[PDB]
Design a protein around this ligand. Structure first.
Ligand SMILES: Cc1cc2nc3c(=O)[nH]c(=O)nc-3n(C[C@H](O)[C@H](O)[C@H](O)COP(=O)(O)O)c2cc1C
Ligand SMILES: Cc1cc2nc3c(=O)[nH]c(=O)nc-3n(C[C@H](O)[C@H](O)[C@H](O)COP(=O)(O)O)c2cc1C
Ligand SMILES: Cc1cc2nc3c(=O)[nH]c(=O)nc-3n(C[C@H](O)[C@H](O)[C@H](O)COP(=O)(O)O)c2cc1C
Ligand SMILES: Cc1cc2nc3c(=O)[nH]c(=O)nc-3n(C[C@H](O)[C@H](O)[C@H](O)COP(=O)(O)O)c2cc1C
Ligand SMILES: [Cl-]
Ligand SMILES: [Cl-]
Ligand SMILES: [Cl-]
Ligand SMILES: [Cl-]
Lengths: 173, 172, 173, 172
């Protein structure tokens, strides 16, 4: 099995739920998933991650709450202490993906993906067209969509997780 | 073999050379490569691409000249005519990569934005490796010194081959 | 009186209404306002603008519809033909401001403001804190807020226009 | 006189020199200038600034060193502690400007983002003038040639004075 790290920062519990969704989706993708959160400057049942352990995974999904469109200082400060890993090129060709929350945050997405790109990580974006197709799909199936994540957002997170998982699996097998 | 499109816009021939380098590297990666340029609004021997043919490739490398840090209008206007492909989701899970020439970070971000919204899998530059290269070629006995330098061309080749191999692994 | 140009691109009539609001607000700011739209690649009573006329105004407000978070090709193509003006430095120290529509578009705002910045134009941003204060204000006054622009958005546009106008007036008097 | 704060973060002394240049230029613009640096997480003779004092100035110039194209964490962490000032709207209509050192367009965009959301009036670089400068000093008889060059320092000074005069006009 490929190993995936779901690393998140949640200020109000939203991004945590999104992260759990992504992790579940990734487990359904046949990956060994570990859920962790970044240090502070809330579910304590979730272990706190270290910057140096990121090289121990084949894929890394980063999700973070946002403040007025920018990265949360916690996630950015966490990723800033991965200079050694960068110097080694330890994260090169590892699969990565980013989730952001505004509970629009394009700048945050760009910044997080910037830090991930400079590590040489392969980036898996959102499936936008599919995510707008989803409403029509669930309408056809007989169950239309309609601070706390909706069903559509969670489904999107799950799908994202599984997609990243399968892609990683393809890259290792 | 996986099929790759090296699509470029060059205002003065720089990005054309970079594109040829990338295409060569991709050929060395065991990929079937097609080199094409976007329409205007100088090498006429290089075929002009159509927006709708992008779905016919397993991987797409986009290189563009930049103006004061932004995307060239040609490339953006070309990519703006892929609305149908987006609606179909024709480019989802296709491997992509971006080269930019003049710093032009904003252009990189915009091009990668358009490629991301198509759901394309993005392959970035190997930055740490790109600083390692100087020391490498110094150890080898051949240090690096309008027209791309040897280091930049080698970087383009490496990028192309990397994308090629990644695509091959994703399709094999 | 200071002269202001309200230049806009509207695909579906939203940004046009926002632009009219901004223009009215600017007139209330004591400025001589001219409303224009960029060429195509819809109110034909509104004159089409030329790239070279931008130097004839003390202030320029740019509003544009957005496509998946990016600038509309019309506005960008229009601003791309102002190379001569840039070469002269004709727009240096002229007051500028940007409105964007998604009928979030942070990247579009950044790009438009990028083109305006490289001309050396003085940038007047949105009054964010005031714009969230506005709801509470109109609630206190006895008239709470609640494809087609809402009352709050139009009021924001008007306020923006007047603010830009007064700032420009201060810079010329 | 209008009051201006030149707030900077320097990792290796470059942005410190740029900041001194900007402060000098602003003094020549008839402004009362205070030079300060952000806290850490080398010149101890330069006073350390507090997040809440930013409202005491008519104009604020922010200069910061950059790391791989992004904002330095120090400056961003400092500006993140101005939530109260934002809630009050204390920095609305105050004149602002940004200098960045290494291309670092993303850092410029982020810093200007934080300054914009405070409602600060933004004064950019004079780019066309900054390419005019070389030809100017060539005509004058003194062509330009880790430590900022004469052209960069002159640019910093010009920026400072420009911001100063603009602020003075906005308060006069
Ligand atoms: C996530 C991340 C990405 C980085 N990307 C680059 C890079 O693209 N180019 C580079 O020269 N250094 C990069 N670095 C290294 C830093 O920019 C910095 O040069 C290094 O950590 C040493 O910094 P210092 O000696 O000034 O403390 C990166 C570091 C991190 C943590
Ligand atoms: C490169 C590209 C990316 C696009 N990404 C999105 C997207 O992420 N979400 C979306 O709703 N539409 C997306 N579109 C579709 C456009 O937003 C637009 O709706 C389409 O071109 C037709 O719109 P129009 O009739 O207003 O011209 C994209 C189109 C292109 C060409
Ligand atoms: C809105 C705008 C902003 C520009 N900003 C810059 C700039 O910051 N630096 C620069 O060298 N040229 C700038 N230019 C000029 C163009 O980048 C370009 O160099 C010039 O128009 C001539 O281009 P060409 O000879 O390749 O056609 C700007 C042009 C426009 C229209
Ligand atoms: C520099 C800066 C800019 C801010 N801009 C905005 C803004 O544009 N809109 C907004 O709602 N809050 C803005 N804020 C407030 C923060 O988003 C945040 O709500 C505030 O710091 C308190 O949030 P917290 O309790 O979640 O930490 C800004 C704060 C700072 C420091
Ligand atoms: Cl959250
Ligand atoms: Cl070129
Ligand atoms: Cl519109
Ligand atoms: Cl420095």
């Amino acid at each position: 099995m490929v190993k995936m790290l779901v690393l998140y920062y949640s200020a109000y519990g939203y991004m945590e739920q999104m992260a759990k969704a992504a992790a579940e989706g990734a487990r359904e993708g046949g990956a060994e998933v570990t859920l962790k959160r970044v240090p502070e400057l809330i579910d304590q049942e979730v272990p706190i991650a270290t910057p140096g352990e990121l090289a121990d995974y084949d894929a890394i999904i980063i999700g973070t709450a946002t403040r007025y469109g920018m990265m949360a200082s916690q996630m950015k400060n966490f990723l800033d202490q991965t200079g050694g890993l960068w110097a080694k090129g330890a994260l090169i060709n590892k699969v990565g993906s980013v989730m952001v929350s505004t509970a629009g945050a394009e700048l945050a997405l760009i910044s997080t993906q910037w830090q991930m790109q400079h590590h040489g990580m392969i980036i898996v974006p959102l499936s936008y067209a599919y995510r707008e197709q989803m409403g029509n799909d669930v309408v056809r199936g007989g169950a239309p969509y309609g601070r706390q994540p909706s069903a559509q957002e969670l489904d999107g997170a799950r799908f994202q997780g599984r997609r990243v998982a399968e892609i990683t699996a393809k890259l290792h097998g």
